[PDB]
Amino acid sequence: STGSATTTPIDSLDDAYITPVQIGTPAQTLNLDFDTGSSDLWVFSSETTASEVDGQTIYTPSKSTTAKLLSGATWSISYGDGSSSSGDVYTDTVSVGGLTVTGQAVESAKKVSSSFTEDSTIDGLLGLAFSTLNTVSPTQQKTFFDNAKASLDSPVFTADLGYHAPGTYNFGFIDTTAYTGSITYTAVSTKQGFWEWTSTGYAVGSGTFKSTSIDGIADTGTTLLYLPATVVSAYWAQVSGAKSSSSVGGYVFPCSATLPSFTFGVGSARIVIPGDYIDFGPISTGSSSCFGGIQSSAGIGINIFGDVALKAAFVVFNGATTPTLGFASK
């Protein structure tokens, strides 16, 4: 089997992407944030505290003839951005782009933090990291991909995120029309539960490539590119007037600037992030200070190849017995 679904930016900045997901019978379609940095499929629901729901579409398990309470199971998650959610668990039928999993754990939120409430466009998350990170207790549950894997034509999914445009998540096949040149594959460590890999270096603009190993995670659920302070300083030093602002929470730059590109290495291959992808616009409405899309990972504890990086590439998440990651230009 295979599946193919379009993923759409939630706003004009590409802050996140939502993908329609069918849950239950008859189908209830919710727009979920596919997150290769976590491993829980959780949804706003009829059980979510009423004051914490503001415009989201909810899953109502009592209206699904295939929903079953997973008795005794609870979940609770905290994300890198300080947001969180928790609740109980149902199993139900879940379909993405024509690919159906029966008995998928659907984690129903009883509580969500303010960041989730305030974002009307995201009805929940669909985790695509390794199932060892799943938070369901006392019986850990499998991700949608892990459940689908054996049925797929090939044990892979791909992320093809757009810049200010829709893109695609495919399951079970590689669309050879969706990228240019060849795909370069690189080793993955699953030791921390992430799609963790090592970039071979970077360049700023038309500058020379610096060969240096940068360990990080491929994370579709993180907006920005978070890299070591040395690398980030070298980038922003090429933008007149750019500076790190403790009050704002990272590097800012004059909105009048033209940003240089940023290149990262994948083996001997190179992915170029155009300068425009690094612009996250005014820090507040009407400001002439703009927020940068490359930020320091210092104090996160890990480097993160988030959407800023991934949307410059066609990315293969290869879930074979020994997982790997592939990157192609597009």
Distance of CA 286 to the CA centre of its chain: 29
Contact 48/111 with Cβ under 8 angstroms?
Answer: yes
Q: 231 with 144, same domain? A: no
Instruction: Give the closest residue to 89 by CA, choosing from 102, 100, 105, 78.
Output: 105
* CA distances (Å), origin 28, targets 66, 75, 147, 323: 12, 22, 20, 32
Last residue within a domain, chosen from 174, 207, 225 = 174
C-alpha distance from residue 114 to each of 29, 54, 81, 164, 224 (Å):
23, 10, 12, 26, 21
Same domain assignment for residues 12 and 37: yes
| Largest interatomic CA distance in the chain | 60
Question: Following CA atoms 154, 180, 7, 294 in sequence, which dihedral angle do they give, to the nearest 10 degrees?
Answer: 110
DSSP 17-41: EEEEEEETTTTEEEEEEEETT---E
Radius of gyration of the chain (CA): 20
How many domains are there within the chain?
2
Choose, from 14, 33, 35, 307, the residue flagged as catalytic. 35
- Based on the domain organization, do 183 and 270 belong to the same domain? yes
Q: What are phi and psi of 175, to 5 degrees?
A: -80, 100
The DSSP symbol for 7 reads E
Cα–Cα dist 28/89, whole Å: 16
Q: What's the one-letter identity of residue 147? A: N
Domain boundary among 123, 151, 174: 174
Question: CB atoms < 10 A from the CB of 215, how many?
Answer: 12
C-beta neighbour count of 209 within 10 angstroms: 14
- 137 given a catalytic annotation: no
Kindly state whether residues 19 and 165 are assigned to the same domain.
yes
Which 3 state secondary structure label does DSSP give 150? helix
In Å, what is the CA distance from 212 to each residue of 120, 200, 267?
41, 6, 11
> What span, in angstroms and rounded, lies between the C-alpha atoms of 109 and 43?
6
d(CA 76, CA 90): 14
Q: Are 97 and 151 found together in one domain?
A: yes
Residue 295: count other Cβ atoms within 10 Å of its Cβ. 25
User: What's the Cα-to-Cα distance from 236 to each of 65, 100, 227, 277, rounded to whole Å?
Assistant: 55, 45, 12, 14
115 flagged as catalytic: no
Contact criterion met (CB below 8 Å) for 76 and 14 = no
Given in angstroms, what resolution was this structure solved at? Answer: 1.2
Looking up residue 104, the CATH number of its domain turns out to be 2.40.70.10
Q: How many CA atoms lie within 13 A of 16 on its CB side?
A: 20
Check whether residue 296 and residue 326 sit in a common domain. yes
List the one residue out of 256, 255, 252 whose CA is nearest residue 294. Answer: 252
Domain finish residue from 174, 194, 229:
174
Amino acid at 143: T
Looking at the fold, whether 261 and 301 belong to one and the same domain comes out as yes
Residues 18 and 84 in one domain: yes
Asked if residue 238 and residue 219 are part of one domain, the reply reads yes
CA distance 83 to 154: 34
SS3 301: coil
Closest CA to 308 of 249, 225, 203, 220: 225
Cα–Cα dist 268/271, whole Å:
10
Domain shared by 134 and 270, yes or no? no
Q: Which domain does 299 fall in, by range?
A: 175-330
Distance, in Å, from the CA atom of 245 to the CA atom of 239, rounded to the nearest integer, reads: 15
Q: What's the CA gap between 175 and 36, in Å, rounded?
A: 19
From the list 199, 261, 296, 297, the catalytic residue is 199
Across the strands, what pairs with 69?
A: 90
Cβ neighbours of residue 226 under 8 Å, at least 6 residues apart? 216, 295, 296, 297, 300, 302, 303, 304, 306
Q: Which residues pair with 157 in a beta bridge?
A: 171, 317
Angstrom distance (rounded) from CA 299 to CA 19: 31
Considering the domain architecture, whether residues 190 and 266 belong to the same structural domain is answered as yes
Token readout for 233 is: 């300083």
d(CA 157, CA 135): 22
Same domain for 32 and 86, yes or no, is: yes
Burial of 202 (0-12, 13-18, 19+ CB in 10 A): buried
